[PDB]
Amino acid sequence: GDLQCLCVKTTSQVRPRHITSLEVIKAGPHCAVPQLIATLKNGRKICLDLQAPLYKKIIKKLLES
Amino acid sequence: LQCLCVKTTSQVRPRHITSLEVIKAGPHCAVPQLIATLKNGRKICLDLQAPLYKKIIKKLLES
Amino acid sequence: GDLQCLCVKTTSQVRPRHITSLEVIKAGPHCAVPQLIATLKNGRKICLDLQAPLYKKIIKKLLES
Amino acid sequence: GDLQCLCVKTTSQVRPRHITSLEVIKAGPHCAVPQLIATLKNGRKICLDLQAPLYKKIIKKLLES
Secondary structure: OOEOOOOOOOEOOOOHHHEEEEEEEOOOOOEOOOEEEEEEOOOOEEEEOOOOHHHHHHHHHHHOO | OOOOOOOOEOOOOHHHEEEEEEEOOEOOEOOOEEEEEEOOOOEEEEOOOHHHHHHHHHHHHOO | OOEOOOEOOOEOOOOHHHEEEEEEEOOEOOEOOOEEEEEEOOOOEEEEOOOOOHHHHHHHHHHOO | OOEOOOEOOOOOOOOOOOEEEEEEEOOEOOEOOOEEEEEEOOOOEEEEOOOHHHHOOHHHHHHOO
16 A cells, blocks of 8 residues: 555566666655666666665666776 | 556546646556656646646746 | 756757657756656667757657567 | 855765755766755755765764664
8 A cells, every 4th residue: 555666577688788777766755665766778767676786786887997 | 558657537636736737648657647746746647638738837837 | 955957968969769768857856847758779878959840850750660 | 067065165074963964976977076965854955065974974964763
C-alpha cells in the first residue's frame, strides 16, 4: 500500500559503460524504499537492483568519467 | 514489455511537476512512457491519458 | 543558485524519427525559459526551438507508440 | 554542442539529511566533468564537489533509507 514506486522491476542486464546517469532516490511517504534509476545512452531508463553488485561499479565508472 | 513504468498514476497536481520525460516505445518496452518529476524530487509514471499530459505539457511549455 | 540552463542553443535540423526521448524542463531558478532536450538514437542530445513547431511533431511521433 | 554544464558552481557543505535525491551525471559532450546533483526537501537543487567519501556517505544515507 505504501509502495507507489517507479521501481517495481529492477535489472542487472546492462553494460556500465552504457549508463549516462544514475539517480538515487530516498525512500519517501509514497515509495518507502530506496530507488536507483539509471539512464542509458538511448535515453532509456531502468531500475537497478538495490543491493546487487552492479550498481556499486556503475557509480565508480560514472565518477571516473 | 521490459518497461520501467509497469504501473502508472494520474494522482498528481500539474503545478507540482518540474519536468516531464517522454520516452518513445521501443524493443524493451512496448508502449510510450511518461515520467514526471515533482518539486520535492519524486518521480512517477503518468497514465497515457491525452487530456492530462496535454495539460501538463502546457503548464511546462508556458512557464 | 547552483544550476544554470542546460541548453546553450537549439537545433532545427533533425528528424522526428531519430528522437528516442524528449525531456521538457519547466522554467525556474535554474533557467528562466523552458527547455526541450531531445535524445537521439545514437545517444546525442540537442535542444529544440520552442517557437518552432518541430517539437509538437516530435511529441506526436513519440506519444504514438 | 547544444548543452553546457548544468552546474555553474558547487556547494561544498550540506547535511546528508536534507537530500531526497542525488543524480550522478557522467562526463560527456555536455560537460567535461561528472556532476553531483542533490535535490533537497524544499525542492532546492545544489551541486556537490566530486569528493569520494563525502557523497559516498550521502549515497549510503539514501540506500539505508
